[PDB]
Design an enzyme around this catalytic site. Structure first.
Site, PDB file in Angstrom:
ATOM      1  N   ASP C  38       0.812  -1.219   0.000  1.00  0.00           N
ATOM      2  CA  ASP C  38       0.000   0.000   0.000  1.00  0.00           C
ATOM      3  C   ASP C  38       0.850   1.277   0.000  1.00  0.00           C
ATOM      4  O   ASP C  38       1.842   1.357   0.718  1.00  0.00           O
ATOM      5  CB  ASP C  38      -0.935   0.029   1.223  1.00  0.00           C
ATOM      6  N   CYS C 170      14.740  18.019 -29.021  1.00  0.00           N
ATOM      7  CA  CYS C 170      14.244  17.903 -27.646  1.00  0.00           C
ATOM      8  C   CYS C 170      13.963  19.259 -27.043  1.00  0.00           C
ATOM      9  O   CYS C 170      12.907  19.863 -27.231  1.00  0.00           O
ATOM     10  CB  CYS C 170      15.259  17.192 -26.758  1.00  0.00           C
TER      11      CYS C 170
END
Lengths: 366, 366, 366, 365, 365
Positions: C38, C170
């Site tokens: 979790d 980029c």
């Protein structure tokens, strides 16, 4: 001849780079440090990221000088090897871009001087920026920054013309001959690129600084001048004088040739049976490299500019071995940099072709 | 004539500076520390940069006093050597400019007392600033700060006139004789520059402080007075008294001549066979330099003001050698400063021409 | 068929996963690390929580790549075992969701490039996102991201179309072949899902990168290209080449088959009597894994792509054992990960079905 | 017996200060710590600077008690030495001013109870502030805070008047007898200053707390009461009882005299051949000073109030030496304070003239 | 009565508390930790102060569970000893207040899920809050939270009715059976208090989790379910299963009785000549208490719920002695808590009267 213990190449090799049209292997490895690794190399991005300077613990106020000295070296790389000229131009493009980030100039605003770092004074920042604009265009032929270069050049010209003393102050009421030398050199570069005669002002500036700002006997400039009080701070400075003489030699070679012998007598200590040398920062001390700690490094650049291979070898023998250079994955590193701006200034001195030859750099091949 | 162990110059040499018209070499090296290195020397820039104080760990609340005491010492440098007067003036310009930065006065707002540090009360800040305005003008002849000087002097005079007790408070409801002493001296300096008679309030102030704020037999002032309650804190204080008597000696020499030998009996401990001395901060203790830790250093100033070469030598033999002075690259440093404001107060005491002499400093003729 | 210390399954078992239609137990244990605990597992929630990456000290600029390489591995997991296809689809949905959090793309804004990370340039980010969009839909039925996928695909197509060179930069002025390979692969995925011919632009790109961006003899790409100045950085890069050849093999198998032998001769060092191998990052060095430190890890993925079982075994024998794998509560951990992106790239290389195979993924159910 | 190593003056000497009209030298040294050094002494400035508390690592929730206990001690100093009365008055002025700084009351807001710390409940802050308004005026005769004092006294009394139980809560639905005792004492101070009868409400409160809130056989109060649920927490508390009985003794001496001997039997451990004593915080333990760690220090105050010189001497012999007092430049310091509020509560206990005496304080000048 | 080294009371003693109408002394010392010291005890104040949890280093995401598990324990304390029912009610009032603090639910906003923590999904928070509302009213008879209780119960009912699967998700597209079990249990409590039939949705939910989400041979639930992809994560989880079977036992005891022996065979390792046990978190491992590290602690609760004294004693002999319990100034402490939520879950298991008994809790009167 041969190279001393902790040295990477001979002095003969560095001086021959231009003649041979190739940089030495350690100069290539420094170019690799500057360019190679993603995000953290200093010339990776035109963006406002300063990771490489953070990694080196560069103090904020010193970042603008680091960028500027990288740029001045890159300009000589372009002259050395035609095949690295495009790379040098690209790195210069990035240097201009990073130079304009607020991380770089924002101390101006934090100190309370204003929000606009080019408007007036602050020649310490905009002198370098203007020279960089010009060197970028000499190398690439690109007009990317032309409007900006014209605007800043006229601003600098108008400031000079309107002052009662020759030159401009950096901060309000502080006058430094070394920051002026950068500003006047940028006028010579602008005149080279365009029709102009901004350089005409250089004569009055050379006559002015030789009056009260220099000790002609010792061939050394005083720390700073303060036009409002009329004060000249009474200590002479070696790093100040080496920087200034080096750039002045590009505009008036006779000027620097007159004081260089006297400069060496005043500040330079030869030791280790003639093999090494170190430079005192001011008079009346035995201590070397006091103050900002850069006397020896700027004298290394001066020796290179004046063609003094002996003093160059002596200084590099003192400066480089204790720093412990190594090359790793074809990239240059130092384990123990001995000063601020360390890899920057050793890079510049190894490649420097003379500020005069930068002025006469031939057009790119197109 | 003999140099005591660990000392840089004789007490004879410090007292002889003005007659010989030259500072000692260690005083010149203190001026170098104050002026030499880019960005981090305290008097490099008029901007709001306080790196010098940061490196010395100066508490925020103490920066205003650091700058003020440097300024008082520079005013004497101007009297000592005509050739350093332009530099002293420059440094004083920078001092006034830095004094007005929020880093220096901002505690007034942070404590919740107000947004304007000169408006009312806060004499501890605006007293020093007003006196610096006047000293700068006496040294340089410049009217740069003259309008500001007029404005603050009238604020001080008006406040004094409105108060049913003689003088002005620091914090709301906190009255300190030493802070008042600075305020009144600034009135004398204004009157010297201009035609005025602002100093006329001094006699009533001197009457008041000799009535309940001093123990006349011990020659010592109580810590503080608090007008609203009428309270006088029942501890006497040495640093308080040394500072106050030194300044008062410039306005009413007989006042200070009267209490000075009683003050010495009350607080000064001579030791090491008469070679050294140290100063107790209050009564009923054997401990030296308790409280804020400045009893000895302010008594060094007072000994200079009063012409007491014997006590000056004893205190300096106590204060300076264990701080480990050295001169590196012609600049003075201490490895172990013993208190707050250490290089400031030693600098000031070594050069101090007397507050009377400052008040009557001749014009920068030549 | 034997297993050295620190290996968890044989190279034979990894290459046989698809034929067995089952992942190896250590790959299942890696899926447990990704999904089990979790809050702190990387694929626990679609929310913008990055606790998993904080626990691994992932630099924020690298998180986008971590998420993308997880995504590419999950796509092969869906192809390998039909029983895990739903879980792999669920994880891919979470990948896309997290990929859009400002923690992931926000560097674009902080560097000063803009507030919108897909608008133009920034292909290093939006190329990977666009590929992820397509792989998600191939694996699952889902049209959850269909509108976003169409929109970004168009942006990329138009940006390619308007450029004078083949491809997309980029950051501004920086062109990388490996980031382009991702963008082009995403065009093929889009065409696969729909009726289109976005991929028609591939031929020109492949012709262009073979001209100046590659050394044909060494089978290696240069570090980067910079269109404005025309510069190609003169260093060849192994991690660059391995990644690029791996993705291009999925679009033009012949392209990569041409350069692979030369690439291996250039960069790969076999050692320990043929049992291990490690990869040099650039030419003219004996150092392995310099630079970003991922030459060996990306060569591991290339070996898998190219079907080179011998090199794959050698590289995993170099990389995995020193990292000290252990399986605790059926979940895989490493004590000493040897690089950035360590568990991400070993996961990808262990399951990778081939980029061509992923383009040809059989359609999901209804 | 002789003066043991870490003691500074005899118990006889502390109890004789008022007869002699002079504080002891170490009390004077504490006043020097409080007043002497620029900027960092606690009573240097009426401003909202708290550097003296920062230097002592005072938790923010505790600063309000620090200032109040200083103020209660300063009031006795005024009674002891007429020559220090003006100083005590000045320090009390500063105490009231700092008390109103948001650094001091701001937890009320941060905890989410509201922006105004005085309008309702929060007796833990405004009970102390109200008592300090009144002590300042008894000491100085100044009317500086008279309007605020009138305002807050009416707020407090109205709140009492409206409650179905006797008293007021601190936090919502948390009722503590010690915080109430402070509130009621401030009503007596107001009546002494003005014509009034606010104290008439004290009898119903004393009646009420002797029912469910006290164990009459052990002479000990339960930790707290919570009116909405009717809950009374089932543990007894020594620090709670010692503080409460000290203050009630000033309003109803018989009440505290009845329970004091039981309290001692319940909580106090004499050790070291009668030379020392330490106080257990609750029942069913041998541990001294558990919980908030203040049982022994509040019992030191209560011994002083009840005039028990033997127990005062025993507790101070336990508390003071391990803290390592010294006087440096005529100012008191402790190298190793053993609890929260340490120099505050030893200061208070050394000078404390009795809460009834404070109530009857003669006009200044 | 024989007592192992780091145990404080026997299992027989814990199981006898309700018939003796009194908690054991170590359970009373745990209530002392929860209630005693000013400012820093977890149930000191209804305000949004969380010092108690900061001192224990509770991760923020975990605080909602700590408050909830304390509340479930306090409800049993109320049933055990009538003399502590008021206190238990007071503590539940505070629990509900603190639960509503943004420090507790704010992860929902920070993750980017929204600014309202109750309107949709987020059952992991609001299921606990809803159960807490009901337990408060059963214990006290107070209607302080009744409107909020009715509202949230209706929200939960409508969300179940609108879903195409039986139940509610936590985060978007994350379905957890343990969090559902809390929510359905809260409908039973509302029905008990009022006339209603919200609980009727329970049969369809138990039918669904049994068909798709449990491995009936192993008596164990899968980690989670993800409705939009249909994925069920293929690992079984012990802490998931223990928690779910304990709460389900209160609604359909036959359901839990069917799987409990199979669950023990699957996960529980008895060791040390039958004196101890420890629980594996998943299948195909020899490691105990992997994952979130709570398998044994939740199986302790389950053993209490099922009445399994032998397994309870084994697990507590594994869990408690290495944490080193002691009693200091009548308050319980551990040197080395072995997991998250440690004193919370050991508290809960020591007092737990059964979830069905809680539902049937008689009025205080």
């Amino acid at each position: 001849a041969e190279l001393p213990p902790g040295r990477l190449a001979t002095t003969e090799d560095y001086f021959a780079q231009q003649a041979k049209q190739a940089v030495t292997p350690d100069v290539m490895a420094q170019l690799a440090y500057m360019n190679y690794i993603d995000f953290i190399s200093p010339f990776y991005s035109r963006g406002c990221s300063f990771e490489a300077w953070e990694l080196k613990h560069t103090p904020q106020r010193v970042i603008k000088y680091s960028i500027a000295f990288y740029a001045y070296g890159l300009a000589s790389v372009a002259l050395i090897d035609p095949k690295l000229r495009a790379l040098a131009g690209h790195d210069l493009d990035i240097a201009v871009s990073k130079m304009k980030c607020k991380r770089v100039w924002g101390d101006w605003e934090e100190d309370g001087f204003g929000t606009d770092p080019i408007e007036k004074e602050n020649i310490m920042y905009k002198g370098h920026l203007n020279l960089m604009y010009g060197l970028y265009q000499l190398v690439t032929g690109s007009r990317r920054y032309e409007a900006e270069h014209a605007h800043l050049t006229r601003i600098i010209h108008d400031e000079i013309a309107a002052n009662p003393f020759a030159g401009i102050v950096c901060e309000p009421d502080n006058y430094f001959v070394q920051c002026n030398s950068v500003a006047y050199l940028s006028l010579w570069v602008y005149d080279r690129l365009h029709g102009t005669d901004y350089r005409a002002a250089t004569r009055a500036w050379l006559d002015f600084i030789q009056k009260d700002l220099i000790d002609p006997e010792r061939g050394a400039f005083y720390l700073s001048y303060h036009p409002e009080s009329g004060a000249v701070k009474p200590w002479i400075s070696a790093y100040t004088t080496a920087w200034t003489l080096a750039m002045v030699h590009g505009m008036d070679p006779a000027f620097s040739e007159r004081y260089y012998p006297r400069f060496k007598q005043t500040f330079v200590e030869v030791y280790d049976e003639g093999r090494k040398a170190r430079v005192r920062e001011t008079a009346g001390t035995d201590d070397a490299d006091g103050g900002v700690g850069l006397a020896s490094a700027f004298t290394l650049l001066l020796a290179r500019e004046m063609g003094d291979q002996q003093l160059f070898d002596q200084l590099l023998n003192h400066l480089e071995p204790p720093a412990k250079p190594s090359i790793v994955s074809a990239s240059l590193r130092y384990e123990h940099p001995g000063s601020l701006l360390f890899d920057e200034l050793l890079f510049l001195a190894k490649v420097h072709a003379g500020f005069g030859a930068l002025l006469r750099m031939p057009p790119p091949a197109a």
